[PDB]
Design a protein around this ligand. Structure first.
Ligand code: KKI
Ligand code: CA
Ligand code: NA
Ligand code: ZN
Length: 366
C-alpha cells in the first residue's frame, strides 16, 4: 500500500499571533520527528502547490476568497466592515501570509485527493489540513478555507459515495454543513458535546432532504479513554461501511482529542487515537488522512508521527530518535503517552445507548 505525504517547509513559519493557541510550527515538529525515524525512506514526499482562488471557489464564495486574498495587518483599518462580515480579526486573526497559509494547507488536501482519484497512491497524508470549521462565506474556529470540503469535492468527481470521519475533539460542523443535504457524502463525527465549541453535532442532527440519515454524530463527555472510544469507533465505522459502502474515505485526525491537550478534555493515548487509523485501513479503500487540532504540540508531533507509521504499516520504537526539537519531548523522550487520572464522564451505559441509537439510524439506509 503506497503512501504519499504533503509538506511545505514554510508551513511552520506562519504565525497566528502572540497568545494564539494554534501553532503551525507543530507541523514542522511532526515532519522533523518522522524524518528522524527514517519514515521518508518508505513514502513519497511532495510539496503542495498553492491552491488557486479558482480551486477555492469550487466551494467558497468569490467575495470571501477575494477578501482573504486582500486582507493584511497593514490594511485592516480599511477593511473593518468586511472583517466583521467574514468573521476575520479575532479568533480567526489577520496575520502576515494568511492567504499563502490557506493555499498550502488546501493544496496538500486537494493534491492528495487528485492522487487517490488517479489511483497513483492508496493513502495520501496532509497534516497541514483538516480545517473543518470553515464555512462557505466566513472563517470560524481558527479555520479560513475548508480544505476538507474541497478535497471531498475532488473525490466526488470519481466516487459516487465518499465517507468523512472526524476524530478531532470538536464537531466537524463546516464539513457536515457542506454535505448536509446530500447522500453522496456521509459525515461521521465523534466529539465533545455540551456547551462546547462549535455547539453543533447533536446526535439528533442526522441530515436533511436527500441527506437524511447521511450525517452521523456521536456526542461524548469529558474524559473518554482508549478502551471506551475503541469500543464504539470500530462497531460504528463497521456498520457505516456495511450500510453506506463508500468507495473513498477522508479521515480528519485532529489531535486535540489526546490526553493532556491544552484545550481539550479527552483522555486518549496516541495508541488509542491511532487505532482509528488502523480500523479505517482494514476496509482497503483509498484514504486521505488530514490533520486537525492539537495544542500540546509535543503530543501532536508524537500522534501524527505514529499515525504516519501506521499508514506505512511500520512499527517504530518508543525511544525517540534525536531530532531538532528533542528538548520538547521531556521528561521521558518517548513516543507514546500515558493517560491521566481524569474521570471518564462517559458511562458504559451512555456509550452503548448512543451507539444503539446510531445503529437504528444506520439501519434506515436503503
Ligand atoms: N475559535 C474559537 C473558540 C472559541 C471558544 C472556544 N473554543 C474555540 N476553539 C477551540 C479550538 N478549536 C479547535 O481545536 C478546532 C480548530 C480546528 C483547526 C484544525 C487545523 C488548523 C486550524 C484549526 C481543529 N478544531 C477551534 C475553536
Ligand atoms: Ca470530531
Ligand atoms: Na451528508
Ligand atoms: Zn479541534
Amino acid at each position: 500500500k503506497k503512501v504519499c505525504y504533503y509538506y511545505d517547509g514554510d508551513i511552520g513559519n506562519y504565525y497566528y499571533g502572540q497568545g494564539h493557541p494554534m501553532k503551525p510550527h507543530r507541523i514542522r515538529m511532526t515532519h522533523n520527528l518522522l524524518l528522524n525515524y527514517g519514515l521518508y525512506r518508505k513514502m513519497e514526499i511532495y510539496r503542495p502547490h498553492k491552491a488557486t482562488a479558482e480551486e477555492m471557489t469550487k466551494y467558497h464564495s468569490d467575495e470571501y476568497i477575494k477578501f482573504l486574498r486582500s486582507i493584511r495587518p497593514d490594511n485592516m483599518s480599511e477593511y473593518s466592515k468586511q472583517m466583521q462580515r467574514f468573521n476575520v480579526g479575532e479568533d480567526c486573526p489577520v496575520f502576515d501570509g494568511l492567504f499563502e497559509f490557506c493555499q498550502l494547507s488546501t493544496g496538500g488536501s486537494v493534491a492528495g485527493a487528485v492522487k487517490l482519484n488517479r489511483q497513483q497512491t492508496d493513502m495520501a497524508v496532509n497534516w497541514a489540513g483538516g480545517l473543518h470549521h470553515a464555512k462557505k462565506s466566513e472563517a470560524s474556529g481558527f479555520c479560513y478555507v475548508n480544505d476538507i470540503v474541497l478535497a471531498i469535492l475532488e473525490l466526488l468527481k470519481y466516487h459516487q459515495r465518499v465517507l468523512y470521519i472526524d476524530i478531532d475533539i470538536h464537531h466537524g460542523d463546516g464539513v457536515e454543513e457542506a454535505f448536509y443535504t446530500t447522500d453522496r457524502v456521509m459525515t461521521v463525527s465523534f466529539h465533545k458535546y455540551g456547551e462546547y465549541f462549535p455547539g453543533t453535532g447533536d446526535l439528533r442532527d442526522i441530515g436533511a432532504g436527500k441527506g437524511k440519515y447521511y450525517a452521523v454524530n456521536f456526542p461524548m463527555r469529558d474524559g473518554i479513554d482508549d478502551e471506551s472510544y475503541g469500543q464504539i469507533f470500530k462497531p460504528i465505522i463497521s456498520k457505516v461501511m456495511e450500510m453506506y459502502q463508500p468507495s473513498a474515505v477522508v479521515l480528519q485526525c485532529g489531535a486535540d482529542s489526546l490526553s493532556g491537550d491544552r484545550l481539550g478534555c479527552f483522555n486518549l493515548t496516541v495508541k488509542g487515537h491511532a487505532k482509528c487509523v488502523e480500523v479505517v485501513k482494514t476496509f482497503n479503500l483509498p484514504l486521505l488522512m488530514l490533520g486537525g487540532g492539537g495544542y500540546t504540540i509535543r503530543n501532536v508531533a508524537r500522534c501524527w508521527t505514529y499515525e504516519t507509521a501506521v499508514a506505512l504499516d511500520c512499527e517504530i520504537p518508543n525511544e525517540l530518535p534525536y531530532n531538532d526539537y528533542f528538548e520538547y519531548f521531556g521528561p521521558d523522550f518517548k513516543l507514546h503517552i500515558s493517560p491521566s487520572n481524569m474521570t471518564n464522564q462517559n458511562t458504559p451505559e451512555y456509550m452503548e445507548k448512543i451507539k444503539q441509537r446510531l445503529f437504528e439510524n444506520l439501519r434506515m439506509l436503503p
